[PDB]
């Protein structure tokens, strides 16, 4: 993994995450 690779992972998954939650 690159790190361009992981930065993106972490805007996606922190952006749907904080978009929206389970609860």
């Known amino acids: 993994e690159t ?11 922190s952006a749907y995450a904080a978009k929206r939650q389970a609860s």
Request: aromatic fraction near 0%; charge should be positive.
């Open 3 to 13: 790190p361009a690779q992981r930065q993106a992972r972490l805007l996606r998954m």
